[PDB]
Scaffold this motif. Structure first.
Motif, PDB file in Angstrom:
ATOM      1  N   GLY A  73      51.771 -12.352 102.549  1.00  0.00           N
ATOM      2  CA  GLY A  73      50.554 -13.122 103.294  1.00  0.00           C
ATOM      3  C   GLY A  73      49.612 -13.932 102.166  1.00  0.00           C
ATOM      4  O   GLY A  73      49.657 -15.168 102.488  1.00  0.00           O
ATOM      5  N   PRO A  74      49.142 -13.536 101.378  1.00  0.00           N
ATOM      6  CA  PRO A  74      48.296 -13.949 100.443  1.00  0.00           C
ATOM      7  C   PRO A  74      48.832 -15.026  99.694  1.00  0.00           C
ATOM      8  O   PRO A  74      49.883 -14.606  99.305  1.00  0.00           O
ATOM      9  CB  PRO A  74      47.546 -12.856  99.663  1.00  0.00           C
ATOM     10  CG  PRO A  74      47.813 -11.643 100.443  1.00  0.00           C
ATOM     11  CD  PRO A  74      49.210 -11.762 101.341  1.00  0.00           C
ATOM     12  N   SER A  75      48.193 -16.112  99.265  1.00  0.00           N
ATOM     13  CA  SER A  75      48.812 -17.078  98.560  1.00  0.00           C
ATOM     14  C   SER A  75      47.683 -17.963  97.761  1.00  0.00           C
ATOM     15  O   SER A  75      46.624 -18.046  98.333  1.00  0.00           O
ATOM     16  CB  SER A  75      49.655 -18.101  99.634  1.00  0.00           C
ATOM     17  OG  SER A  75      50.582 -17.363  99.957  1.00  0.00           O
ATOM     18  N   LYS A  76      48.023 -18.381  96.804  1.00  0.00           N
ATOM     19  CA  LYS A  76      47.193 -19.159  95.818  1.00  0.00           C
ATOM     20  C   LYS A  76      46.761 -20.518  96.430  1.00  0.00           C
ATOM     21  O   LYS A  76      45.866 -21.023  96.731  1.00  0.00           O
ATOM     22  CB  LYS A  76      47.847 -19.566  94.385  1.00  0.00           C
ATOM     23  CG  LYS A  76      46.659 -20.133  93.807  1.00  0.00           C
ATOM     24  CD  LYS A  76      47.221 -20.650  92.330  1.00  0.00           C
ATOM     25  CE  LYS A  76      46.018 -21.221  91.487  1.00  0.00           C
ATOM     26  NZ  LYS A  76      46.757 -21.471  89.988  1.00  0.00           N
ATOM     27  N   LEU A  77      47.763 -21.013  97.238  1.00  0.00           N
ATOM     28  CA  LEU A  77      47.444 -22.377  97.849  1.00  0.00           C
ATOM     29  C   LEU A  77      46.520 -22.222  99.131  1.00  0.00           C
ATOM     30  O   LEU A  77      45.798 -22.950  99.422  1.00  0.00           O
ATOM     31  CB  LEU A  77      48.939 -22.816  98.360  1.00  0.00           C
ATOM     32  CG  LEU A  77      48.762 -24.205  98.802  1.00  0.00           C
ATOM     33  CD1 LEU A  77      49.861 -25.231  98.388  1.00  0.00           C
ATOM     34  CD2 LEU A  77      48.771 -23.957 100.321  1.00  0.00           C
ATOM     35  N   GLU A  78      46.854 -21.014  99.808  1.00  0.00           N
ATOM     36  CA  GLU A  78      46.114 -20.908 101.105  1.00  0.00           C
ATOM     37  C   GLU A  78      44.807 -20.716 100.483  1.00  0.00           C
ATOM     38  O   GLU A  78      44.418 -19.919  99.588  1.00  0.00           O
ATOM     39  CB  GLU A  78      46.531 -19.414 101.711  1.00  0.00           C
ATOM     40  CG  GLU A  78      45.778 -19.234 102.924  1.00  0.00           C
ATOM     41  CD  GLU A  78      46.098 -20.359 104.065  1.00  0.00           C
ATOM     42  OE1 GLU A  78      46.963 -20.951 103.762  1.00  0.00           O
ATOM     43  OE2 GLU A  78      45.379 -20.563 104.874  1.00  0.00           O
ATOM     44  N   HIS A  79      43.730 -21.275 101.300  1.00  0.00           N
ATOM     45  CA  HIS A  79      42.271 -21.205 101.142  1.00  0.00           C
ATOM     46  C   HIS A  79      41.966 -21.849  99.937  1.00  0.00           C
ATOM     47  O   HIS A  79      42.859 -22.006  99.287  1.00  0.00           O
ATOM     48  CB  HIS A  79      41.844 -19.613 101.119  1.00  0.00           C
ATOM     49  CG  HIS A  79      41.024 -19.412 102.242  1.00  0.00           C
ATOM     50  ND1 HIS A  79      41.745 -19.077 103.455  1.00  0.00           N
ATOM     51  CD2 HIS A  79      39.706 -19.589 102.596  1.00  0.00           C
ATOM     52  CE1 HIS A  79      40.616 -18.865 104.521  1.00  0.00           C
ATOM     53  NE2 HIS A  79      39.390 -19.014 103.747  1.00  0.00           N
TER      54      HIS A  79
END
Length: 78
Positions: free
Chosen positions: A72-78
């Motif tokens: 779920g969590p991603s560096k690109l996200e947000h």
């Protein structure tokens, strides 16, 4: 913090609370730690060497937490 967050998720499912175990093996000169956590029927164990059982529990909880969110969590996200 992260460990508690994982427990809260299980509580919401009203299914079963997370469980973790810790074992000690190896010579005194070269001690080795190993812990396994069972969440939602899935078993996760610290993928890295843990100096203390605390690190093992964290590593297991983190894996289960991340696994639940499924990348779920991603560096690109947000």
């Amino acid at each position: 913090m992260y460990k508690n967050q994982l427990q809260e998720l299980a509580q919401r499912s009203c299914f079963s609370l997370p469980s973790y175990t810790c074992t000690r093996e190896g010579p005194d000169h070269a001690p080795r730690f190993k812990a396994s956590v069972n969440f939602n029927g899935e078993i996760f164990e610290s993928p890295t060497y843990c100096s203390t059982l605390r690190q093992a529990e964290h590593s297991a909880a983190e894996v289960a937490l991340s696994a639940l969110s499924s990348k779920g969590p991603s560096k690109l996200e947000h």
